Amino acid sequence: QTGDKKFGMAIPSTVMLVRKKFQDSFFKDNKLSDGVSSYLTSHTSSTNQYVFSNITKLVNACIAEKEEAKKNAGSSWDETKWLQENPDWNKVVLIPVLVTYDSSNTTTGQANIIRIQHDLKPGYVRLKGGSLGKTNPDYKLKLEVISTDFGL
């Protein structure tokens, strides 16, 4: 944060990552976090990071969607056409959210989430990477995947 201002705007404490297909439907239907289509994480002030740490279910969901589309189309499939349409198949958005918990089951503590909603108090943060990463590889994020290779 800039300026060392006394009463300035703070970094959003909790953010949600959701597939762009559900960008507005998620909040209009009052859904809770899906696990296979959206994730919640807190800011890690000791490193200045938002980290999601395992988004495997979302990747499998996207792969299954495209494979099912290819299976239904059969011999008349065209990969370029199907990526030229449905341009938000593989896009996700990061949203500041306000998350509230229930208070009961207190001694055997669990703290279930009961409402996720848009964060409307003033706050901001400046993230690394940007639109110049579309052309220049210095300004582009990396996604890290680890797997088991059976050698077949």
């Binding site: 909040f27 909603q117 582009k140 088991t148």
Partner: protein, 53 residues
Amino acid sequence: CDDNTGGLGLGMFPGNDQNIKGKLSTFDVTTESVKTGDIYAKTNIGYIGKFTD
């Protein structure tokens, strides 16, 4: 009472057991700023005031 045998044994196990490996690979993700749109707020708090940044 020992429970380890160490690592002696691999090399005689069948191929589909001793060929399994782990791996790390990385892929590139682009990000950009986008406008908010017409969000559905629906909160019970009412906000009143002004400030300059």
